[PDB]
Design a protein around this ligand. Sequence first.
Ligand code: SF4
Ligand code: SF4
Ligand code: SF4
Ligand code: SF4
Ligand code: FES
Ligand SMILES: [Mg+2]
Ligand SMILES: [Mg+2]
Length: 576
Amino acid sequence: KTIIINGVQFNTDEDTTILKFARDNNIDISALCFLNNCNNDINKCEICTVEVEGTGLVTACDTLIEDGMIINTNSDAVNEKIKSRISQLLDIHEFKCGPCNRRENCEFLKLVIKYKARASKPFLPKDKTEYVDERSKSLTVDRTKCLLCGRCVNACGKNTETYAMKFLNKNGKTIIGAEDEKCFDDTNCLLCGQCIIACPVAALSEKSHMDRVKNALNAPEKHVIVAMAPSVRASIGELFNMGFGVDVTGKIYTALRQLGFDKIFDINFGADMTIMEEATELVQRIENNGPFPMFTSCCPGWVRQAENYYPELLNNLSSAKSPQQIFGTASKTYYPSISGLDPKNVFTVTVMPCTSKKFEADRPQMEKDGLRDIDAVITTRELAKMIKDAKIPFAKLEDSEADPAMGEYSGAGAIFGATGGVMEAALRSAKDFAENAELEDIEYKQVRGLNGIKEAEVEINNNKYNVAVINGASNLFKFMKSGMINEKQYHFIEVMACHGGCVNGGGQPHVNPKDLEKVDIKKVRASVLYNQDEHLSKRKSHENTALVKMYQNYFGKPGEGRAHEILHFKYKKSAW
Ligand code: SF4
Ligand code: SF4
Ligand code: SF4
Ligand code: SF4
Ligand code: FES
Ligand SMILES: [Mg+2]
Ligand SMILES: [Mg+2]
């Protein structure tokens, strides 16, 4: 194939699109609605317009290169078309970047600046109320920003296969929204936030908890704990121009203290708690021969998936609370027992890579004696905004340490944020528990990485067991519908709704499509976690010294008695 682009001849056997070929050859072509290898098939944005001689204007993102093509990407006709399409979007776009939560990394703004586009008539609604949907505990929509680019809808379909995000005809006008324009929470939506991650503008956002947090911080009598997810320390630096794959754990603890939090703990401590309980449960089921399989229950996207699509599995989920909720439960019981705080005055905040966690935290029964396990959840992005609003020079901060009583963690805990991490951590403990031993071979590499469905055979106490790690909500549907679950007897199955695990969650920093071509975001964020594991002296959850003291002095033996009564949560299917 001979191809001419802007007068440059290429000879190639490649079978690909003009966009991808141009991009591979450092020729600039803009794009908007193209993402995840899909464009918006109905109502194409045409931002990737180029000129093919003899044919006219074509969309480079979905037009294959052909031998003999002569292509101009930067002709006056091309730029005028693209400029026109951007101007048309400005006509339906509340272009007020100042207070906008995507001000610093918005794709549309870059395009507006690049083509010097202007609205015919500026879009300036006075009553945004009709345009905004904040009903959800997790997601919010601001349709004054929406480009109808279809990226949320394609990403929902690809990532989850639920198609909970849809195009809708609302009184004759096209919008995106949930089925029947219901609140997302009241539909089959997993509240995973992959739609947000796909959004080029500030149209989709997380449901804010930042005022819950600020109010508690400013309330004189409130004692505000904060505790961040595994993934936050591998990710948040991205929003402070520190690049990718930077471990900023120490800087976060310092930042959190500068924001005025009263105690700095860590959700990885809660991940060790979850393993203590989950691994103990796994050994129990093995001894009662069932029910099998046991599924993890720590991902609320998956819990919602089970609730909405496989309620028959709800009884197979581990009764262990998730690291978030189990930590929170302890934060209102154990923590007062070792601090003297009145439990009513403890306000527990988590920092998560996740939008679904907001919903988990607000489940009615996720409380005891009137006290919420978790009072607020802020996403990685929300914490980055709080830090920037406070003029905290994050990239310049010195390292500090967590408060150890609910802040220590093992390397088992540290890897939770990657797909296969829970499985690996859980097996490090279950094997030790079952064989009553302290084994030295603790790396389960076969359950790691980005394959959609991963399985392994493991030997526990001289019997074989089958494990699977389901990596992404769409892969959970594949596993079930294809009958894979019936090819053999599965004993323990991990499910994460987000592909890559929590490091790719819905609350994470946006990465623009070009950086994504350049960096494997799932692997690079995950690598921070595995590195921590490798350098920690304690690499099993049950060797966490602070955790051991808590169980010895307060909860007693895992998986029974007081531990079972307050650290566990069971989901029930509705009756016939
Ligand atoms: S979505 Fe982007 S272009 Fe629109 S107001 Fe916000 S920052 Fe500006
Ligand atoms: S919400 Fe965002 S991703 Fe979805 S159509 Fe609107 S601008 Fe595109
Ligand atoms: S939160 Fe997840 S399941 Fe719900 S619409 Fe967005 S991508 Fe789809
Ligand atoms: S994989 Fe992690 S970030 Fe994604 S929905 Fe589940 S808990 Fe949330
Ligand atoms: S980027 Fe090609 S039509 Fe939208
Ligand atoms: Mg297409
Ligand atoms: Mg305070």
